[PDB]
Amino acid sequence: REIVHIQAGQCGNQIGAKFWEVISDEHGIDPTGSYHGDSDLQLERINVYYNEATGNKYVPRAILVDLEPGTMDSVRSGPFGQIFRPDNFVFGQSGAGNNWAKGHYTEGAELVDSVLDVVRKESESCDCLQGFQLTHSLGGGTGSGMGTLLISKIREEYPDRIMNTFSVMPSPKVSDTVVEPYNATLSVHQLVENTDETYCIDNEALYDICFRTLKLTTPTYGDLNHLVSATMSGVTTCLRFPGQLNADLRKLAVNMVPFPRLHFFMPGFAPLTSRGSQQYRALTVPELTQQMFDSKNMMAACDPRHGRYLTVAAIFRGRMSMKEVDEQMLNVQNKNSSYFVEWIPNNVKTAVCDIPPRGLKMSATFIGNSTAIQELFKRISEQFTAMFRRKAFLHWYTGEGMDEMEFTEAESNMNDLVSEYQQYQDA
Amino acid sequence: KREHEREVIQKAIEENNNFIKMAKEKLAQKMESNKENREAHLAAMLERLQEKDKHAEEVRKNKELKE
Numbered sequence: 001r002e003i004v005h006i007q008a009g010q011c012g013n014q015i016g017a018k019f020w021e022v023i024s025d026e027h028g029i030d031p032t033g034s035y036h037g038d039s040d041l042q043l044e045r046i047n048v049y050y051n052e053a054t055g056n057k058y059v060p061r062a063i064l065v066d067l068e069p070g071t072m073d074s075v076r077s078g079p080f081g082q083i084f085r086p087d088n089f090v091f092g093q094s095g096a097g098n099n100w101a102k103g104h105y106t107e108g109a110e111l112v113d114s115v116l117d118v119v120r121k122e123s124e125s126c127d128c129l130q131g132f133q134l135t136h137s138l139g140g141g142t143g144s145g146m147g148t149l150l151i152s153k154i155r156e157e158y159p160d161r162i163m164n165t166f167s168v169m170p171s172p173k174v175s176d177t178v179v180e181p182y183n184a185t186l187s188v189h190q191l192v193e194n195t196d197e198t199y200c201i202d203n204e205a206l207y208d209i210c211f212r213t214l215k216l217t218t219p220t221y222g223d224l225n226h227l228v229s230a231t232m233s234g235v236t237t238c239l240r241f242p243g244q245l246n247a248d249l250r251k252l253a254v255n256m257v258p259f260p261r262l263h264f265f266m267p268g269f270a271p272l273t274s275r276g277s278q279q280y281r282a283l284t285v286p287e288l289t290q291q292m293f294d295s296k297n298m299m300a301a302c303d304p305r306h307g308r309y310l311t312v313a314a315i316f317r318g319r320m321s322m323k324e325v326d327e328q329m330l331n332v333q334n335k336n337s338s339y340f341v342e343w344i345p346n347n348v349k350t351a352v353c354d355i356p357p358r359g360l361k362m363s364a365t366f367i368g369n370s371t372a373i374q375e376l377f378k379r380i381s382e383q384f385t386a387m388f389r390r391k392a393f394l395h396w397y398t399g400e401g402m403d404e405m406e407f408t409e410a411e412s413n414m415n416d417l418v419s420e421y422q423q424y425q426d427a
Numbered sequence: 428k429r430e431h432e433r434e435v436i437q438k439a440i441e442e443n444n445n446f447i448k449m450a451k452e453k454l455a456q457k458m459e460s461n462k463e464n465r466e467a468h469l470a471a472m473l474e475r476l477q478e479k480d481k482h483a484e485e486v487r488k489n490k491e492l493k494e
């Protein structure tokens with residue numbers, strides 16, 4: 001059951017590269033693609049994410065995409081950059097200028113067939129393709145505009161495969177341009193229709209965590225991406241390793257999404273750690289459980305107590321008592337039962353994996369489908385309309401052939417998404 | 428959605444082309460009327476200088492008649 005990974009644009013390729021660094025280390029693959037590994041749990045499901053090449057090398061099933069060559073050069077210059085298959089670098093030259101319209105309609109359209117050709121080659125070698133995972137931001141032009149263009153075309157050619165994304169939401173606290181709310185809103189409209197699951201990675205939350213919890217005065221994208229790579233490693237655990245669950249992307253979708261459009265997840269992680277500085281006391285299973293459910297550990301800047309959990313998936317990594325894990329997980333639900341919808345019985349499922357992530361003896365990763373995610377979309381909707389009511393900065397988009405009407409439809413669809421999440425928060 | 432995608436890029440091509448077209452026609456019309464107007468002004472200037480030669484001939488004629 002092979003997954004095809006695609007990373008698009010500046011943010012997509014930077015968090016994409018970190019993800020492949022991190023899970024390669026967990027599976028015992030070095031920058032050359034060779035396995036110098038301790039345990040054999042590391043290789044049992046290694047084919048979900050890695051093609052095997054002659055000479056027992058492991059090559060990521062990864063495609064790197066950008067309309068601008070710069071950050072893909074840095075990836076190839078990067079530590080594990082030599083592990084990626086060079087044919088799977090697909091890039092243009094003109095960039096996207098932080099413009100969804102250029103990524104989606106004019107620049108990205110010129111390049112998208114070359115990417116689909118690379119997607120096809122990787123898929124035809126798959127015994128049974130699960131589907132795809134895309135890393136991208138929603139605030140730029142390439143990951144957002146061309147990424148959602150790729151999703152739409154991938155769906156046309158593979159309509160029975162699962163589409164999963166890790167989507168980084170823009171925040172004024174960590175912001176490149178004023179038009180991010182425009183790019184994000186146009187993208188969400190695409191994500192609502194064309195993904196089965198998207199992890200909402202909120203740059204607001206990543207910033208708040210670094211500043212407040214990790215006491216990092218001036219957080220860089222490097223500090224943000226340490227959080228992102230830890231979250232990506234955790235939420236993938238049950239796809240990559242053998243366990244009592246043996247999950248795949250479709251089963252995750254079936255068990256997490258009660259209504260098709262409500263497929264946007266708040267990820268959570270514990271313990272929260274900053275890069276480089278290690279702390280030497282492991283948590284207790286009781287500590288892991290409380291931190292993973294704490295709003296201060298959510299990667300989407302929403303208060304869970306402002307909504308209800310439709311479904312939750314939790315994964316505990318490290319050598320620990322599964323009895324204690326079970327008791328602590330039962331404890332949080334029984335003590336906080338009002339925050340779990342009563343009409344989905346037993347909507348919390350826990351998995352355990354023996355292999356911990358690098359640098360931690362124990363970790364807990366949280367995947368929540370909460371109606372509180374609507375706060376994220378409301379925040380973006382306010383920033384959109386603040387400019388849109390004066391049609392501010394629109395010429396960047398009408399200059400690529402876009403119409404105001406398209407902005408009105410995307411805003412209206414995202415408002416409907418907020419309404420639907422509100423509908424189930426009271427039931 | 429594919430239909431709408433190529434209509435967007437065709438629209439972008441059509442606006443950019445139309446802008447190029449109107450700029451080219453605008454200055455072609457501007458340079459044409461500028462050339463006419465300047466020539467009309469120079470033509471009027473010569474036409475009045477030439478009238479000064481017509482008048483100067485008449486002046487000498489009247490002097491001859493006075494003999």
Ligand SMILES: Nc1nc2c(ncn2[C@@H]2O[C@H](COP(=O)(O)OP(=O)(O)O)[C@@H](O)[C@H]2O)c(=O)[nH]1
Pocket residue numbers: 008009010011012014015096097098137138139140141142143144168170171174175176177180203206221222224225228
């Ligand atoms: N967390 C994180 N966010 C990023 C990173 N790079 C860019 N972003 C976000 O992505 C947005 C810029 O879009 P970008 O991906 O650079 O444009 P693109 O090159 O067209 O894909 C900004 O709002 C940033 O907040 C990164 O390394 N980490």
Ligand SMILES: COc1ccc(N(C)c2nc(Cl)nc3ccsc23)cc1
Pocket residue numbers: 235236238239245247248249251252253255256311312313314315346347348349350351
């Ligand atoms: C709400 O009930 C459920 C929620 C999710 C699942 N499935 C399929 C998972 N898939 C992956 Cl990939 N990881 C995890 C980790 C914990 S559950 C889980 C199963 C039941």
Ligand SMILES: [Mg+2]
Pocket residue numbers: 010140176
């Ligand atoms: Mg950028």
